[PDB]
Design a protein around this ligand. Structure first.
Ligand SMILES: Nc1nc(=O)c2ncn([C@H]3C[C@H](O)[C@@H](CO[P@@](=O)(S)OP(=O)(O)OP(=O)(O)O)O3)c2[nH]1
Ligand SMILES: Nc1nc(=O)c2ncn([C@H]3C[C@H](O)[C@@H](CO[P@@](=O)(S)OP(=O)(O)OP(=O)(O)O)O3)c2[nH]1
Ligand SMILES: [Mg+2]
Ligand SMILES: [Mn+2]
Ligand SMILES: [Mn+2]
Lengths: 503, 503
């Protein structure tokens, strides 16, 4: 194509948008406003109580979702800074419309780095697991694939595929697949837009759209977009938002925002090393024990290896003249540094090298893919952590616990989803209903933000339409998932216990 | 010549320093390395468990020292960005040597903003309280002030003044005043240098030196520097470091680093607004209730000016329309914004206006001088919080609790300070001592980082010297304060309970 970042770095907003002209400084200020909105957001504060690798941890020295997101933000800064430095060295900065958008470029990366994870549920993957597994038993999306049933097994009478040829059956398929396909990424878009009503710039929202697969997607993903459509990137409830976002950022269907690959790279780069640091701190293994696990896990290599210049290098450096520090602290400092100094430049280069496809958002790979020795180093760290950190019984037990907690909470609120459309809308209208004490009482438990979202969405539906009862139930289930995913590891754990009368 | 920021923004280090020439990019990378060191520092991670206004808070929506420090960092960024923008308008950027140091200028501010609370003890003005009160009743610095004296209440036989006269008594005075003058700011310098061995750039360290008063200062004086010397800025244990730092940053005795004023301004601006937001969240009062409390200090002598421009503007903007925006959330959003838009420019201008004195580090005021209507707005927020947030029984209760906890821990470890020099050094040598089981076990409880610091310091002392026993006791007390101040609110609370055999 013709790479013009002015066409992608969009400073307009969905609501009460800044309009027309705006100087270099004026545009900077717009993006700086987004930083303030995001940093002061309770959604980001909530991260210091959301788990990363070690659940419900009471050691501050261990990373939370917030401290991790903060570290990712620095890797993202370094990558963005290096992309711009090279583009300036290639003279291509002015040529790519970036000469006046240097600051926004950097800031967008840094902020979408802090905001990846914003939509993650209480017990991470076990939160995703519990939510989807609970919904999957309720409405079976398995049965919605063909045209009849003859059973369907979907408990929801409205959502069963009657029968009895209907184009309305397509909505049922979409709704059933979408509700069983909760993803932190998809929930993130829902969160920043529909639920938090942060009025971020279009460019800032494009940065947190990591995947391009619609949650309701049922088939095999297109060969050309297999990677970008890896996981669901957005829900049915956002289809319209995503559609305006696509227009506002000049994105093709299922195409990604150009700055996302920067953020994505920064994410992989920082959790790997970090997770091993935390394991040593928890006392899962010693720094010497870790070094031996890494040496095992590596190809061999060793002759003309990256292992030598990175992990071996950090190991030797941390043995002596580490007397001016401490063996383990010194090791991780060098390991981080060496990894960054080799991977950040590669990522930066990779971005610039494949910039036409990346810009188009059609590029079907990550910045640090298979074929590179660089990519292999990252895989090494991941493999060691999988085999020796994640496999730890105390970690695994909390994962099992988390799953029980989330599943339990879903079952606790189940009666709200069990109510009839008329009875539920009666509960929505007259806040407290006489014949439904328990139901009204929970309904009140749901965060006002989440409840308004339901009201707002359902209000926009045409009541007369035969689609209406199906849409209402979709949004009612969405409301519930929003509440649950919204909670911290700790709040979910407490709420579950308080509502079981075991506290 | 005169204002030359090249002479203040020092990229050199204490240990293994980068040397000679360096590219604008190369220097950027040096300061970016500091970001990485600070962000990945466990000392910063520990902040997500240290308290800000509401102690041991179980709601993630309430700020911790880390989330607040993060917010200060953004205000600092905006102030830094505005100072540079205006200097660029004025054409003074090239003239002040800043043309090539734009990034470091901003980064140094941002980082010293994030690190501003690094040295704060658990609880934490109550930690300072408990630490100083505990030490004051052990070694009364009260009696050391005057000529010796004769019956000084100092329990420490060594540190007791003569009856009698000597110049070694001056060391006793210095040691007794210093140990009773713990201050988070002074502990921060100790932390980044002696304890964490971060090896930041000289400029980066100068940024966290908020006060220029030596902890041991006994003098009532000295007008000209009465503001800069408000609180202790460094301990006796870092007198030498501070001396090298003074040389490296071309600072006069008791003169401050030019960028500190920026960081300082951001911290005040941020805390006032955030604490009122948190109070509303903690349901201490409603947003309506808050508006009425503010509509008191006003002052309606204006009658339609700054209060009407900021807080009345935020109040009116919060009423009606919203668009899934809760009146509570949108009010604080506008209050913050309006405050920033009026105070950040003032601070930025104040800095530029008094730049000669601020550069020299002789400027005896903060950027928000009491005289300004701007300064008054900040006082309004503070006053509302003082008489309606900080006065809350639950807050006050935790404060009382915190004080008992810290005092308790100090009394728990008291036997280590009770040991003779020979016995304590025997304990330091043969890690385990048979004749001292409790003392042995307690010594082991102390952080290895902290323990090494004692060893390293005492090793450097000349054993033959009559100063040696006094210096050893100073470093022994320092070691203890290091341990205690090092803990989070939670760790201190747990440790106290575990060591009371009540857990
Ligand atoms: N405890 C634990 N058990 C596990 O089995 C496990 N697997 C991974 N991790 C943690 C360690 C890391 O902190 C974290 C990264 O999360 P993610 O899997 S969301 O990674 P992305 O790059 O975001 O892929 P995506 O597109 O899906 O977002 O996974 C785990 N932690
Ligand atoms: N609950 C409570 N009770 C109190 O009595 C109190 N007093 C203040 N605060 C809290 C509210 C604020 O969030 C916090 C500010 O801390 P600070 O700024 S004082 O610390 P430094 O970095 O040393 O700068 P400086 O020394 O010049 O003040 O104090 C309090 N909080
Ligand atoms: Mg202050
Ligand atoms: Mn991540
Ligand atoms: Mn503060």
């Amino acid at each position: 194509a013709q790479i013009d970042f002015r066409k992608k770095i969009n400073w307009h907003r969905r609501y009460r948008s800044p309009q027309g002209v705006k100087t270099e400084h004026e545009i900077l200020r717009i993006f700086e406003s987004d930083r303030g909105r995001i940093i002061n957001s309770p959604a980001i504060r909530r991260l210091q109580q959301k788990t990363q690798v070690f659940p419900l941890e009471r050691n501050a020295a261990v990373r939370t979702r917030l401290t991790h997101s903060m570290e990712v933000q620095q890797v993202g800064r370094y990558i963005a800074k290096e992309i711009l430095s090279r583009l300036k060295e290639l003279k291509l900065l002015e040529a790519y419309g970036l000469d006046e958008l240097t600051g926004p470029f950097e800031s967008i990366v840094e902020m979408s780095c802090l905001m990846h994870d914003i939509g993650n549920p209480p017990f991470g993957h076990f939160g995703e697991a519990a939510i989807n597994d609970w919904f999957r038993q309720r409405l079976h999306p398995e049965d919605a694939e063909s045209q009849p049933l003859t059973d369907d097994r979907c408990s929801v009478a409205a959502l069963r595929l009657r029968d009895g040829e209907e184009p309305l059956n397509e909505l049922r398929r979409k709704i059933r697949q979408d509700l069983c396909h909760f993803e932190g990424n998809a929930q993130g878009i829902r969160l920043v837009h529909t639920l938090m009503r942060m009025n971020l710039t279009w460019a800032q929202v494009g940065g947190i759209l990591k995947y391009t697969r619609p949650a309701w997607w049922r088939g095999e993903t297109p060969e050309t977009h297999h990677y970008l459509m890896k996981k669901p990137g957005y829900y049915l409830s956002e289809e319209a938002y995503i559609a305006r976002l696509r227009k506002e950022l000049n994105l093709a269907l299922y195409s990604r925002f150009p700055l996302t690959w920067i953020m994505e790279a920064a994410d992989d780069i920082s959790y790997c090393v970090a997770d091993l640091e935390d394991a040593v701190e928890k006392r899962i293994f010693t720094v010497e024990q870790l070094y031996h696990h890494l040496h095992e896990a590596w190809g061999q290599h060793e002759k003309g290896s990256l292992f030598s210049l990175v992990v071996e290098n950090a190991w030797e450096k941390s043995r002596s003249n580490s007397l001016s520090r401490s063996t383990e602290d010194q090791f991780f400092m060098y390991l981080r540094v060496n990894t960054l100094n080799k991977l950040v430049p590669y990522a930066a280069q990779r971005f610039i090298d494949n910039l036409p496809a990346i810009f188009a958002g059609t590029f079907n790979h990550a910045l640090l893919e298979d074929a590179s020795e660089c990519s292999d180093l990252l895989k090494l760290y991941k493999n060691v952590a999988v085999k020796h950190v994640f496999s730890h019984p105390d970690v695994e037990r909390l994962e099992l616990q988390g799953y029980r907690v989330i599943s339990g909470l879903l079952e606790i609120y189940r009666p709200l989803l069990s109510l009839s459309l008329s009875d539920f809308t009666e509960l929505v209208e007259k806040e407290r209903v006489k014949r439904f004490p328990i139901e009204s009482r929970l309904f009140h438990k749901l965060s006002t933000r989440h409840r308004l979202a339901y009201v707002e969405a359902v209000s926009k539906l045409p009541s007369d339409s035969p689609e209406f009862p199906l849409w209402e139930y979709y949004y009612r289930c969405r409301l519930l998932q929003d509440y649950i995913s919204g909670m911290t590891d700790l709040y979910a754990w407490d709420e579950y216990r308080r509502l079981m009368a075991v506290e």
